[model samples]
Target: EHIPGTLRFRLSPAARNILEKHSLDASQGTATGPRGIFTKEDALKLVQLKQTGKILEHHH
Candidate 1:
């Protein structure tokens, strides 16, 4: 058994809420999510970013 993805996609109203579920630290990455939402690659990339240590905020 692996992790998620097992993932689903929905851009309904096109908001950040979707990213919230997929990635808690969604905002930490680039904001390619525009007139809708993020690119799935962009979405999960944020997940990796947080995992790598760029967390919610860093003072550098």
Candidate 2:
């Protein structure tokens, strides 16, 4: 059976805030923070990409 990997870190407050405001998720990010934490920088970039209408489509 295939198992999922453990998540190494969490999203920062700033990151969560931005994500909530835009209905986005950490999995959409192209960046990461210390210890693999999702950071505000990644969230900001996600928002910027969304705002620019160039966010990439993720596939399962």
Candidate 3:
């Protein structure tokens, strides 16, 4: 799950169906993609990052 560029995928169909029941900002990110959009792996990474006090930068 450490693969880079794995957070760009769209949410799973099942997740989408459930999400449609409630309205939300289209821009809101949910993990299931490759580019921080929503992948189980990414969700875990985020948790790790939080624990370690990691922060994202605009221009890396």
Candidate 4:
């Protein structure tokens, strides 16, 4: 079950392709999506954050 306030969304076709190519996880992002969809940039940002070991921090 999903927890309250947890962001969730499905990756777009291009985003999915990028993730698959990079072998990255899509559950580790928050932007580039409008209410439940995402683009390649979203996934790329998450991957960058993960690699850099940087947290997105709280935004509100």
Candidate lDDT (C-alpha), each? 0.49, 0.70, 0.43, 0.66
Candidate 1 has its poorest 10 consecutive residues by lDDT at 1-10
Tens-place lDDT per residue, model 4, 1-60, is 344444333568878777787777676665456656777788888678765664444432
Which residue pairs collide, candidate 4? Answer: none
Model 4 whole-model lDDT (C-alpha atoms)? 0.66
What TM-score does candidate 3 reach?
A: 0.30
Tens digit per residue, CA lDDT, model 3, 1-60: 335554334554544444444432223344646443554443444445444553444333
Which of candidates 3 and 4 is the stronger one according to lDDT? 4
Query: Can you give the lDDT of residue 32 in candidate 1?
Result: 52
Ranking by lDDT: 2, 4, 1, 3
> In candidate 4, residue 19 scores what lDDT?
79
Q: Flag regions of model 3 displaced more than 4 Å.
A: 1-9, 32-60
Query: What's the ranking of the predictions by TM-score, best on top?
Result: 2, 4, 1, 3
List ranges where model 1 is wrong by over 4 Å.
1-18, 22-27, 31-37, 54-60
In model 2, the worst 10-residue window by lDDT is 1-10
Alpha-carbon RMSD to native, per candidate: 11.0, 6.9, 10.2, 7.9
* lDDT (10s digit) by residue, model 1, range 1-60: 222331233232333454677556444444355543445666666667665676545645
